[PDB]
Amino acid sequence: ASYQVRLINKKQDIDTTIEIDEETTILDGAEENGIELPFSCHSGSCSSCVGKVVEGEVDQSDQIFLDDEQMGKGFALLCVTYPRSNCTIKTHQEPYLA
Protein backbone atom coordinates (compact mmCIF):
# COMPACT_ATOMS: atom_id res chain seq x y z
CA ALA A 1 0.00 0.00 0.00
CA SER A 2 0.99 3.55 -0.53
CA TYR A 3 0.25 6.41 1.82
CA GLN A 4 0.16 10.15 1.47
CA VAL A 5 2.77 11.93 3.59
CA ARG A 6 2.50 15.68 4.10
CA LEU A 7 5.81 17.40 4.82
CA ILE A 8 5.90 20.75 6.56
CA ASN A 9 8.50 23.36 7.17
CA LYS A 10 7.78 27.05 6.91
CA LYS A 11 11.41 28.28 6.95
CA GLN A 12 12.21 26.01 4.06
CA ASP A 13 8.97 26.87 2.44
CA ILE A 14 7.88 23.33 2.26
CA ASP A 15 4.30 22.20 2.53
CA THR A 16 3.82 19.35 0.21
CA THR A 17 2.15 16.02 0.16
CA ILE A 18 3.85 13.09 -1.55
CA GLU A 19 2.59 9.62 -2.29
CA ILE A 20 4.91 6.84 -1.20
CA ASP A 21 4.94 3.13 -0.87
CA GLU A 22 4.88 1.71 2.63
CA GLU A 23 8.23 0.02 2.14
CA THR A 24 9.89 3.36 1.36
CA THR A 25 11.36 5.49 4.18
CA ILE A 26 10.11 9.02 4.61
CA LEU A 27 13.48 10.47 3.75
CA ASP A 28 13.99 8.34 0.62
CA GLY A 29 10.48 9.15 -0.54
CA ALA A 30 11.03 12.83 -0.10
CA GLU A 31 14.33 12.63 -1.93
CA GLU A 32 12.79 10.90 -4.90
CA ASN A 33 10.20 13.70 -5.00
CA GLY A 34 12.74 16.46 -5.14
CA ILE A 35 12.53 17.37 -1.51
CA GLU A 36 15.95 17.66 0.08
CA LEU A 37 15.68 16.85 3.78
CA PRO A 38 18.73 16.78 6.06
CA PHE A 39 20.51 13.54 6.97
CA SER A 40 23.96 12.28 7.88
CA CYS A 41 24.25 8.73 9.05
CA HIS A 42 21.21 7.30 7.25
CA SER A 43 21.39 4.54 9.87
CA GLY A 44 19.36 5.71 12.82
CA SER A 45 22.12 6.76 15.19
CA CYS A 46 22.04 10.56 14.86
CA SER A 47 19.70 13.50 15.17
CA SER A 48 20.20 14.84 11.67
CA CYS A 49 17.08 13.69 9.93
CA VAL A 50 14.64 14.10 12.79
CA GLY A 51 11.11 15.13 12.13
CA LYS A 52 7.97 15.31 14.23
CA VAL A 53 4.92 13.27 13.44
CA VAL A 54 1.94 15.68 13.68
CA GLU A 55 -0.71 13.12 12.70
CA GLY A 56 -0.65 9.49 11.59
CA GLU A 57 1.27 6.33 12.48
CA VAL A 58 4.75 5.31 11.49
CA ASP A 59 7.25 2.51 12.02
CA GLN A 60 10.71 3.44 13.16
CA SER A 61 11.64 0.28 14.95
CA ASP A 62 15.14 0.23 13.30
CA GLN A 63 16.00 3.52 14.99
CA ILE A 64 18.44 3.79 17.81
CA PHE A 65 19.02 7.38 18.79
CA LEU A 66 15.73 8.49 20.22
CA ASP A 67 14.42 7.53 23.54
CA ASP A 68 10.84 6.55 24.51
CA GLU A 69 9.95 9.94 25.73
CA GLN A 70 11.10 11.63 22.50
CA MET A 71 9.28 9.12 20.45
CA GLY A 72 6.20 9.59 22.56
CA LYS A 73 6.11 13.24 21.65
CA GLY A 74 6.16 12.26 17.96
CA PHE A 75 9.78 12.72 17.05
CA ALA A 76 10.97 10.26 14.35
CA LEU A 77 14.31 9.65 12.57
CA LEU A 78 13.15 9.96 9.02
CA CYS A 79 15.94 7.90 7.48
CA VAL A 80 14.45 4.84 9.17
CA THR A 81 10.76 5.71 9.36
CA TYR A 82 8.11 4.09 7.23
CA PRO A 83 4.50 5.32 7.04
CA ARG A 84 1.78 3.08 8.44
CA SER A 85 -1.01 5.48 7.45
CA ASN A 86 -1.35 8.78 5.74
CA CYS A 87 0.55 11.22 7.92
CA THR A 88 1.73 14.78 8.45
CA ILE A 89 5.24 15.45 9.51
CA LYS A 90 7.17 18.55 10.35
CA THR A 91 10.73 18.38 8.99
CA HIS A 92 13.96 19.86 10.18
CA GLN A 93 13.21 19.45 13.92
CA GLU A 94 16.80 18.87 14.96
CA PRO A 95 17.07 22.25 16.89
CA TYR A 96 13.89 21.46 18.80
CA LEU A 97 15.13 18.10 19.74
CA ALA A 98 15.37 18.40 23.36
Q: What DSSP line would sit under 46-97, residue for residue?
A: SSTTEEEEEES-EE-TT--S--HHHHHTTEEEGGG-EESSSEEEE---GGG-
Range in contact with ligand FES (rule: CB under 6 A) among 18-26, 28-36, 41-49, 67-75: 41-49
Q: Which of 37, 49, 58, 76 binds ligand FES (CB under 6 A)?
A: 49
Q: How far is the CB of 14 from ligand FES (least distance, A)?
A: 18
Q: Which of 8, 14, 35, 46 binds ligand FES (CB under 6 A)?
A: 46
41 near ligand FES (CB under 6 A): yes
Q: How far apart are CA 75 and CA 54, in angstroms?
A: 9
71 near ligand FES (CB under 6 A): no
C-beta of 1 vs 73, nearer to ligand FES: 73
Q: What is the dihedral of CA 66, 19, 86, 62, to 10 degrees?
A: -30
Q: How far is the CB of 10 from ligand FES (least distance, A)?
A: 22
Q: How far apart are CA 75 and CA 68, in angstroms?
A: 10
7 near ligand FES (CB under 6 A): no
